[PDB]
């Protein structure tokens, strides 16, 4: 009889949740014109 025991103690296990989600900018500022007219240039 001979076993390689590993004896349990409290071991720090900071590893936590993995998940998804879309990245977005900081700053996704559009440009809307506050002035009506032809885009001249």
């Amino acid at each position: 009889p001979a076993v390689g025991v590993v004896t349990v103690k409290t071991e720090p296990l900071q590893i936590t949740t993995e998940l998804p989600g879309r990245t977005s900018a900081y700053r996704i500022a559009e440009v809307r014109p506050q002035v009506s007219g032809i885009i001249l240039k």
Partner: protein, 150 residues
């Protein structure tokens, strides 16, 4: 009980049904089966019905004949042949756990293990066979013609 009844049908039955003289193994009661116990106070939480629980399992748990890189016919100038593994039949309780249901901008992508308590279990529970009050499977052997019971 059902832990036994799968162990019998995965190991014993296919080895007993070709022991000589046996021309019939009946098995009791049935194998395992990934029983998806839905939880209707979790399905209403996600605005789902058991339609969309079944629809995703017939989608994401579906074995798909993908095919072959370098399949037939090739292009003139080919040197590579493989055989693409698509989505396999999903092989575990945890791999049904991450069966997806919708787009998830809650994303810990909407788990089937968030709405349905996944576990294995038998295919019907109409039979409880407690041998001496202790749970049991069984198998009823029927001897073939060539009836050599010894």
């Amino acid at each position: 009980q059902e832990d036994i009844s799968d162990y019998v049908a995965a190991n014993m039955k296919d080895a007993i049904s070709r022991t000589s003289g046996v021309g019939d193994v009946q098995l009791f009661g049935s194998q395992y089966a990934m029983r998806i116990w839905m939880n209707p106070n979790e399905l209403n939480k996600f605005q789902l019905t058991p339609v969309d629980v079944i629809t995703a399992i017939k989608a994401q748990n579906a074995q798909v004949a993908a095919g072959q890189l370098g399949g037939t016919p090739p292009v003139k100038g080919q040197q590579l042949n493989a055989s693409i593994i698509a989505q396999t039949r999903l092989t575990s309780t945890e791999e049904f756990g991450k069966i997806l249901l919708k787009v998830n901008q809650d994303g810990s992508r909407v788990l089937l293990r968030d709405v349905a308590k996944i576990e294995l279990g038998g295919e019907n529970y109409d039979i409880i066979a407690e041998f001496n009050g202790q749970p049991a499977s069984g198998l009823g052997i029927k001897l073939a013609t060539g009836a050599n019971a010894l």
